[PDB]
Amino acid sequence: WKVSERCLKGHGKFQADQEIGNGLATAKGQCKGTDSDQKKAGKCDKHCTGVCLGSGGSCGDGSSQKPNKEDCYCKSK
């Protein structure tokens, strides 16, 4: 799975040419701030499908796979 800088850091190059392997893409910072968990979930899922071009995603929950609550973790198609 290749994703863009925009996917990973939130801004930058648009084309999907960053290799992340077989795991999730870390969309840094997409779940930061004071919005509700539901609203953050929507922002994250749409960043994942619309920018990372994955199937969906979810905010960090402290697990090994999704360790940072401020980050959004996107799954491939």
From Swiss-Prot:
The chain holds residues 20 to 96 of 96 of the full protein. Changing R6A: Reduces inhibitory effect on host Nav1.5/SCN5A activity. Its main location: secreted. This is Salivary protein FS50. Disulfide bonds join C7-C52, C31-C59, C44-C72, C48-C74. Changing D45A: No significant effect on inhibition of host Nav1.5/SCN5A activity. Changing Q38A: No significant effect on inhibition of host Nav1.5/SCN5A activity. One of its GO terms (cellular component) is extracellular region. It comes from Xenopsylla cheopis. Keywords: Disulfide bond, Ion channel impairing toxin, Secreted, Signal, Toxin, Voltage-gated sodium channel impairing toxin. Salivary protein that inhibits host voltage-gated sodium channel Nav1.5/SCN5A. It is found in: Secreted. Intravenous injection of the protein shows anti-arrhythmia effects in BaCl(2)-induced arrhythmia models in rats and monkeys. The keyword S-adenosyl-L-methionine does not apply. Transmembrane segments: none annotated. Changing K32A: Reduces inhibitory effect on host Nav1.5/SCN5A activity.
